[PDB]
Amino acid sequence: PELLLDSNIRLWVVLPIVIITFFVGMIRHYVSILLQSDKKLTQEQVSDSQVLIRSRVLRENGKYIPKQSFLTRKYYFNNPEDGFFKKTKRKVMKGNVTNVLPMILIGGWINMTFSGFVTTKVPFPLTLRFKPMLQQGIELLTLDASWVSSASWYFLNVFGLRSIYSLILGQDNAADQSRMMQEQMTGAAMAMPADTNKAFKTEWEALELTDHQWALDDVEEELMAKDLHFEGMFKKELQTSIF
Amino acid sequence: APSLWKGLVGIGLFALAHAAFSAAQHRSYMRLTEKEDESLPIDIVLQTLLAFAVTCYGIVHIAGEFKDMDATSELKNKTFDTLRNHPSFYVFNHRGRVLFRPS
Amino acid sequence: GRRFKWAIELSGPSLYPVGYLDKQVPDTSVQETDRILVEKRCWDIALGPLKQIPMNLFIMYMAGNTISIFPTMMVCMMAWRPIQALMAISATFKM
Amino acid sequence: AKVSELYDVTWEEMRDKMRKWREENSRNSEQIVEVGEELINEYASKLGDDIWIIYEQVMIAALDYGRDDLALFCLQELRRQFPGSHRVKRLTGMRFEAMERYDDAIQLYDRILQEDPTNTAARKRKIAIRKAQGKNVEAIRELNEYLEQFVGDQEAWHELAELYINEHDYAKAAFCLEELMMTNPHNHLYCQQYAEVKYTQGGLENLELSRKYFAQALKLNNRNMRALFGLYMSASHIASNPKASAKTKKDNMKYASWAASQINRAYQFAGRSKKETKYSLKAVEDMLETLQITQS
Amino acid sequence: PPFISEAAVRGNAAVLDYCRTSVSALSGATAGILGLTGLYGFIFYLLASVLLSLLLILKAGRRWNKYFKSRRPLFTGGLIGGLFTYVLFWTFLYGMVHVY
C-alpha cells in the first residue's frame, strides 16, 4: 500500500461514476420498454398458428386418447384424398443487439473528461502487458498495473451490476383475459415467415412418423395399491369452517 | 415473522457498517505512525464475521417460495362447480334478478 | 334390470363439427423405421464444432498482435464458447 | 355479522380476497358487491391499477345482483380515465343487453368488429345474445364457425360441450371433451366428465372405456368419490350384462368389491368428526350390503 | 414426476439465483472490509459459496424430492457470474478504506 491519495477525489469520481452507470442502465431498460411496439396480425396467420399448436399438442399428448379418435384426428389432418394441409395454400446499418455502442460512448466520454487520474488499485496481480489497457493517460513505467484508471473502473462496474439489475426487476404474469391475447400474439410472431408449404409438408410427414401407445391400458397398477393419502388429506380438510 | 428477519438483516448491516468505520479509523491511525506493520485487532474482525453470518441467514429466509413441481396438486382442491361457469359466456336471465329487483 | 331397481335410461334421437367424422375411416397401418438417415444427420451435427474453428482462426489472424480491448474481448469469448459447451456434454451424449 | 365482519378486517386482506375470488372466478356477486363499494368508500386512495379491475368486477356483479346505479357509477369512472377502450364498450353493450334493446348492443358489436378485426370477446357476447334470443342450434352454428376461425379457446370447447349436453348429443360431446382433455391431461375433472358422458352413451365397450377412464382419474388426485362411485357402478353393470367373458366378470367383481371396501372405510373414518355421521355410515353400509347381495 | 409445471421450476431457479447473487455480493463486501491476497480471497469466496449451499440444503431437509428433482444446480450454479459480481464489491470497499 502506497501512493497516498486525496479524500476529495474519491467523493467526486467513484460515487458519480457508480450513479451514472446505474441510472444509465435503468434509462436503457425503461427506454427499451417504452420503444417496444406491437406488430400487425392477420386473422389467417393466427389461424395456421393455432392449427400448428393443435398438431403439437396432438403429438405431445396422444397417449391418453382413444385409438379410434386418434386415427380419426390423424386422418383428418392427413386425408390423402383431399387433405387440409395439401390443398389450403397461401401465396408468397447492421443493428445487432445495440447495447455495446452506448456503453462504449459513455466510457469514451468518461475517459476523455478524466485525462490523468488514479481511481483505485485492483488486489489481483496483473501483468505489465495490460498497462496500456489500464492507465491510458499516466506517464509511468515503474508503476505496477494494479492501479487502474476510470475507464477500467467503469468497464468492471457495468458487469458488476449485471446480475444486480435482475434483483430489482423480474417477470410479470397477470391479466388472464389478456393472457390469451398475449399467447396468440407471440405464437403468430413465431409463425411470421412465409414458408407455409414446407412447414405443412414437414408436419404432414412428422404426424405419420408418430406411433400410438395407449397409456390408459395400464390400469392394473392402481388396483393393487394402498389408499392412505385420502385420509391424511381428509383429516386436514375438516378443521376449516365455512365463512 | 418476516418483519423480524428484515429487522435482523438491517441490524447486521448496521453492525457491518460500524465495523467498517472502525477499520477505517484503524487504518487512518496506522498511516500516522511510521512502520509498525501490524494487522487490525481480532475482536472487530470477529464482530464483522458475526455480522456477515447473521445477515447471510435472513437473506435466505426472506425470499423463500419453493413451490411444488407437480401441477396436479394445484388443481387438486379446485372443484368442477367453479370450472363449469366461464367469464366469457354469461347470460343475465335468472330468477334472482327479478327476486332482487325491488330492494 | 330389476336388480338395480332405479335405472334411469337416456336415449339419443352439414358437417360443421371440426373433427367428428360421419365415416369412421379405419385401416391405418404405418411401419416406417429409417435409422440410417437419422444416423447420418446426427453424425453431421457433431462435425459442426470441428468446422467452427477455422473461421475463428482466420478472425484471430485478422485481429493481429495489437493489445487492445476489442481483440482481447474477442479472445476471452473465443475460448468461453467451447468450455461452456463442455459443461453439459453429459446430456448431449445421453441424447 | 355484517358489522362484526367489518370490524376484524384490513383493506389489504379485502383486496387479496377479491384477487383470489377473481382467480377462482366464482359466483359471489352478493359478496363481491358487498365488499366492492366498501373499499370504494373506505380507502379510495391508491391502487388505481387494481381499482380499475375492481370497478369492472363490481359492476359485473351488480349487473347480476340488483343494482344498475352502481353499474353506471363505475361506467362513468371507467370512461373518465380511458376515453377510447373496447373493454368499456363491451361492458356497456352487456349492460344494454341486460336492460333492453338488444339490437343497439348488436350494432355496437359490429362497430367494434369493424374497428378491431380480432375481437373474440365481442363475438362471444353476440353468440351468447343469440343463445338466449333464438334457438340454440343457430348459436351452436356460430360457435362452430368462430371455433373454426380461431381453434384457440378452451372455453369455447367447454361451452359447446355444455350446449350439446342439453340436446342429448353425446357423440359430438365426446369429441369435444377429448379435445379439451388433449390440452390438459393432468385435469382429472375433464376426465371425470368424459367418463360420465361415455357411460351415459351406453354399450359394453363404452362401459369398459368409461370404467378405465374413471380409474385413471382416481389415481391422479385421490380426492374424488364421484369417480369411484362411477367405477363401482360400471363394474356392477358389466357384471349384470350376460354378454361378457368369465374372467373379465371375475376381475370386474373384484374391482367392485374393492371399491365397496374403500367406500366403507371412507365413511368409517368420517364418523369420528361428528355424532350424526353414524347414521350416514349405517345408511351407506346397508346400501353397500344390499348391492353386494345383488351382485353376489 | 410425470407432469412438471414450468412456472414452479422457474420460480425455484429465480429464488436460488437471487440468493446466490445476494450472498456473493455480501461476501465481497466482507472480503473488501478485511483485505486479503488473491488466493485467500478466492478460497474465501469458495468457502462462502459452499456454506450457502449447505444452508440451502438444510432449508429443504425432508420432502426435498418435490422441491428439487436433483441437487447438481444447488451445488454447482452461478459460480462464474456470482464471482464476477463478487469481484466488484470486493475491490469496491478495499481501496475505499485502505488506499483512500
Side-chain angles (χ1 to χ4, degrees), chain D residues 249-262:
Chain D
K249 287 180 150 161
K250 332 295 217 295
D251 61 57
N252 272 294
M253 161 186 88
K254 205 207 319 174
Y255 303 156
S257 151
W258 174 65
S261 163
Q262 285 326 278

Side-chain angles (χ1 to χ4, degrees), chain A residues 50 54 57 61 64-66 69 73 177 180 214 216 219-220 222-223 227-228 230-231 233 238 243, chain D residues 5 150-153 175 178-179 182 185 194 212-213 216 219 222-223 255 258 262 265 269 273:
Chain A
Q50 308 261 20
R54 200 167 167 194
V57 278
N61 326 81
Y64 324 110
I65 279 173
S69 293
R73 295 254 171 67
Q177 206 219 297
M180 293 293 295
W214 205 42
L216 264 306
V219 47
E220 303 311 336
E222 188 283 308
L223 273 294
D227 274 358
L228 266 182
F230 88 104
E231 265 286 0
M233 102 189 187
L238 256 62
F243 150 68
Chain D
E5 181 181 0
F150 284 89
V151 202
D153 275 11
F175 175 91
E178 266 151 40
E179 152 56 31
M182 251 178 43
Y194 172 74
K212 271 193 302 196
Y213 267 85
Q216 194 282 333
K219 66 152 173 52
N222 294 36
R223 187 52 72 62
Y255 303 156
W258 174 65
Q262 285 326 278
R265 83 196 259 198
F269 332 125
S273 176

Side-chain angles (χ1 to χ4, degrees), chain A:
Chain A
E2 60 224 80
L3 267 48
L4 171 146
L5 303 175
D6 306 38
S7 305
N8 93 90
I9 176 170
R10 102 181 162 197
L11 184 133
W12 282 103
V13 164
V14 178
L15 285 300
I17 195 148
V18 163
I19 299 157
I20 285 320
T21 198
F22 199 49
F23 280 82
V24 157
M26 221 75 88
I27 291 312
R28 164 221 71 191
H29 160 60
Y30 278 90
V31 155
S32 182
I33 271 181
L34 204 158
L35 281 193
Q36 205 178 40
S37 67
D38 289 345
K39 166 172 45 56
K40 311 304 170 135
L41 243 197
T42 324
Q43 43 276 46
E44 171 69 353
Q45 313 161 303
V46 198
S47 175
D48 42 305
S49 208
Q50 308 261 20
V51 165
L52 264 291
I53 317 304
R54 200 167 167 194
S55 165
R56 214 199 280 161
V57 278
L58 180 47
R59 192 188 317 294
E60 292 174 351
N61 326 81
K63 281 78 71 174
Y64 324 110
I65 279 173
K67 169 126 59 188
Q68 307 83 319
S69 293
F70 170 85
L71 287 304
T72 299
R73 295 254 171 67
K74 187 195 244 180
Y75 180 87
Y76 175 83
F77 275 75
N78 271 179
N79 177 225
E81 169 172 70
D82 254 22
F84 145 77
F85 266 4
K86 291 177 177 178
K87 279 63 172 153
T88 314
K89 182 41 179 167
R90 303 72 171 150
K91 83 164 302 203
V92 201
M93 322 195 178
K94 276 302 210 173
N96 286 333
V97 197
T98 302
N99 57 356
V100 169
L101 277 306
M103 71 96 78
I104 278 188
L105 274 178
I106 291 304
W109 171 85
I110 273 183
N111 161 270
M112 211 55 48
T113 300
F114 316 140
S115 43
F117 275 85
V118 171
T119 325
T120 309
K121 95 185 201 74
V122 291
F124 316 107
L126 268 42
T127 66
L128 315 90
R129 292 118 196 177
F130 297 131
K131 278 197 18 193
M133 301 265 168
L134 294 173
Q135 274 76 350
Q136 170 54 269
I138 317 165
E139 334 310 300
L140 271 183
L141 61 137
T142 322
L143 195 67
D144 197 352
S146 278
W147 321 84
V148 285
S149 63
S150 57
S152 158
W153 177 230
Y154 163 84
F155 257 82
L156 200 139
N157 255 212
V158 303
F159 310 137
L161 321 165
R162 191 198 229 172
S163 301
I164 273 286
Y165 275 141
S166 98
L167 172 149
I168 306 272
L169 297 172
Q171 267 180 3
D172 265 328
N173 269 318
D176 221 29
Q177 206 219 297
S178 148
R179 269 196 219 154
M180 293 293 295
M181 332 296 275
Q182 279 172 349
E183 299 171 338
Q184 323 204 330
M185 291 265 158
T186 62
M190 182 305 298
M192 41 165 48
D195 40 306
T196 60
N197 198 34
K198 62 190 274 215
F200 293 158
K201 214 69 195 200
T202 302
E203 271 288 329
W204 169 93
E205 71 157 50
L207 203 35
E208 282 139 337
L209 264 52
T210 88
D211 287 345
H212 188 98
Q213 160 48 269
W214 205 42
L216 264 306
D217 43 18
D218 187 339
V219 47
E220 303 311 336
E221 167 281 337
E222 188 283 308
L223 273 294
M224 171 91 190
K226 155 209 72 67
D227 274 358
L228 266 182
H229 323 77
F230 88 104
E231 265 286 0
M233 102 189 187
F234 173 94
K235 264 168 222 179
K236 297 180 218 300
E237 181 205 14
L238 256 62
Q239 320 96 342
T240 323
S241 74
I242 290 173
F243 150 68

Side-chain angles (χ1 to χ4, degrees), chain E residues 3-62:
Chain E
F3 319 100
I4 312 294
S5 44
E6 34 183 77
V9 161
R10 275 167 201 212
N12 292 299
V15 153
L16 226 51
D17 290 315
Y18 161 82
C19 216
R20 178 58 51 121
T21 297
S22 190
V23 152
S24 188
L26 188 134
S27 178
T30 289
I33 282 316
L34 260 53
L36 317 177
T37 312
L39 191 87
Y40 280 98
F42 279 112
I43 300 313
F44 180 79
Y45 162 67
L46 252 50
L47 188 159
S49 161
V50 168
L51 165 139
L52 166 65
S53 175
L54 171 153
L55 182 32
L56 265 167
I57 275 177
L58 261 174
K59 179 181 191 179
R62 293 330 159 191

Side-chain angles (χ1 to χ4, degrees), chain D residues 165-178:
Chain D
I165 283 305
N166 262 330
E167 298 314 281
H168 310 305
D169 291 341
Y170 318 89
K172 282 127 191 174
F175 175 91
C176 261
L177 268 204
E178 266 151 40

Side-chain angles (χ1 to χ4, degrees), chain D residues 20-271:
Chain D
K20 187 202 174 185
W21 260 339
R22 288 151 42 192
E23 161 196 320
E24 205 165 11
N25 66 93
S26 210
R27 284 272 211 91
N28 287 265
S29 54
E30 292 209 347
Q31 292 55 53
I32 284 152
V33 158
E34 178 158 319
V35 186
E37 98 300 355
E38 169 124 13
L39 189 64
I40 284 187
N41 312 337
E42 175 178 13
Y43 196 84
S45 158
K46 271 193 180 183
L47 48 69
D49 183 20
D50 274 333
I51 211 182
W52 299 143
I53 298 158
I54 278 273
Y55 276 131
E56 164 195 52
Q57 180 197 357
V58 166
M59 162 265 267
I60 289 275
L63 253 204
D64 177 32
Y65 174 70
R67 270 186 201 183
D68 315 304
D69 267 2
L70 285 154
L72 169 135
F73 170 51
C74 309
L75 221 49
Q76 304 296 60
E77 284 155 329
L78 269 185
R79 284 169 148 186
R80 263 209 273 261
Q81 173 75 350
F82 322 84
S85 84
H86 307 269
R87 288 185 72 171
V88 161
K89 253 178 173 180
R90 155 231 177 179
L91 271 63
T92 305
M94 265 186 334
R95 170 232 173 208
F96 255 42
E97 149 206 342
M99 282 325 317
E100 270 179 350
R101 284 187 183 175
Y102 303 75
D103 175 285
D104 319 57
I106 286 285
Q107 334 85 12
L108 259 183
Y109 286 137
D110 321 73
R111 315 186 165 157
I112 293 198
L113 281 174
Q114 283 328 118
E115 300 329 300
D116 285 347
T118 59
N119 249 327
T120 58
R123 294 186 203 187
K124 287 185 223 167
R125 283 314 301 190
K126 176 195 309 318
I127 271 181
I129 278 174
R130 285 208 263 270
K131 150 191 208 158
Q133 172 215 67
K135 296 167 178 188
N136 33 47
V137 169
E138 171 75 342
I140 291 200
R141 199 192 220 113
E142 321 177 35
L143 182 58
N144 285 329
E145 287 157 359
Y146 155 86
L147 180 96
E148 291 305 0
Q149 241 182 330
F150 284 89
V151 202
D153 275 11
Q154 299 174 16
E155 297 171 357
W157 285 113
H158 202 254
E159 191 58 29
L160 192 68
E162 291 283 9
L163 271 164
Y164 269 76
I165 283 305
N166 262 330
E167 298 314 281
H168 310 305
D169 291 341
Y170 318 89
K172 282 127 191 174
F175 175 91
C176 261
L177 268 204
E178 266 151 40
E179 152 56 31
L180 216 30
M181 183 160 22
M182 251 178 43
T183 325
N184 285 355
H186 57 267
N187 226 305
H188 63 285
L189 290 184
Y190 293 98
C191 307
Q192 193 185 246
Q193 288 273 314
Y194 172 74
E196 202 46 61
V197 166
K198 274 323 192 175
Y199 184 110
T200 279
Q201 280 252 25
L204 79 176
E205 77 278 43
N206 300 326
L207 274 179
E208 291 150 290
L209 248 63
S210 176
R211 153 180 59 100
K212 271 193 302 196
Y213 267 85
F214 263 113
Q216 194 282 333
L218 183 34
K219 66 152 173 52
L220 258 174
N221 190 357
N222 294 36
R223 187 52 72 62
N224 269 114
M225 307 190 17
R226 271 195 230 167
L228 83 84
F229 265 108
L231 159 74
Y232 166 85
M233 297 267 156
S234 187
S236 196
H237 257 103
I238 208 64
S240 182
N241 251 354
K243 284 82 61 183
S245 211
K247 43 99 181 183
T248 191
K249 287 180 150 161
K250 332 295 217 295
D251 61 57
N252 272 294
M253 161 186 88
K254 205 207 319 174
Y255 303 156
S257 151
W258 174 65
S261 163
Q262 285 326 278
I263 292 207
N264 271 345
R265 83 196 259 198
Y267 281 94
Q268 176 60 239
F269 332 125

